[PDB]
Amino acid sequence: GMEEDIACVKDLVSKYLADNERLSRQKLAFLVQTEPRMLLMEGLKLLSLCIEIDSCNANGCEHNSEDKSVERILHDHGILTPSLCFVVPDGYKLTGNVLILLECFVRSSPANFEQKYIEDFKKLEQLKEDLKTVNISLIPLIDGRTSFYNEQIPDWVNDKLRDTLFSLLRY
C-alpha cells in the first residue's frame, strides 16, 4: 500500500537515474528508506546533489561534498585567514591566491529567485573584502536555477519523483 507506493517510486529512480558513480552513495541512501519523511528527505538530497555536481562540472570546481567552510578550505591549502563570516560553498577552486567559490540554488518563482540571489550575493561579497586583506582574490560565482532539472535524470521523471515524494507524506 504505502509499501507499494514506496517500492514504486524507488523503481522509478532505479530505471532513470544516470549510471554515475558519484551518485551511488546517495542513490543507495534513498533506496534503503522505508518511511515517507526519510524517503522525501533523501530524495530531495539526491536531486540537490545532481544539481551541485552539474554546476561544479560546468564551472570546473571541486564539489564541496564535506560541507567545509571557506575558512576550512583555505586552511586545508595552507592558508590562514582572519575571522571570516561563515560560508559553506557548493564548489571551490584554489589556484595560487585566486579562490573561485560557487553557490547554486533553485527558485521557481522570480520574486524568490531575486531575493535569494541578493542573499547569496551578500554572503559572498562579505568574504571578498575580508580575503583581500590576506591577498586572496575571491571570485564569487552564483548559479541560480528556476527548476530542479539536471543532467542526471529525465525532466519528466524529476517532476514525477518530487510530486510523489511529497504526496507520500499521506502516510
Residue numbers in the entry: 0 to 170
What does the paper say about this structure?
Despite the presence of 2 mM MnCl2 in the crystallization buffer no anomalous scattering was detected in the active site. Compared with the X1 form, the X2 and X3 forms show a 17 degree rotation between the helical bundle lobe (residues 4–49 and 149–167) and residues 50–148, with the hinge being at the base of helix αb. The closure of the two lobes slightly changes the orientation of the active site residue E51.
Segmented negative strand RNA viruses of the arena-, bunya- and orthomyxovirus families uniquely carry out viral mRNA transcription by the cap-snatching mechanism. This involves cleavage of host mRNAs close to their capped 5′ end by an endonuclease (EN) domain located in the N-terminal region of the viral polymerase. The sNSV cap-snatching ENs belong to the PD-D/ExK superfamily of cation dependent nucleases. We find two different kinds of endonucleases, one with the characteristic catalytic histidine (His+) as in orthomyxovirus and bunyavirus, which have efficient endonuclease activity in isolation, and a second, without the histidine (His-) and conserved among arenaviruses which shows very poor activity in vitro.
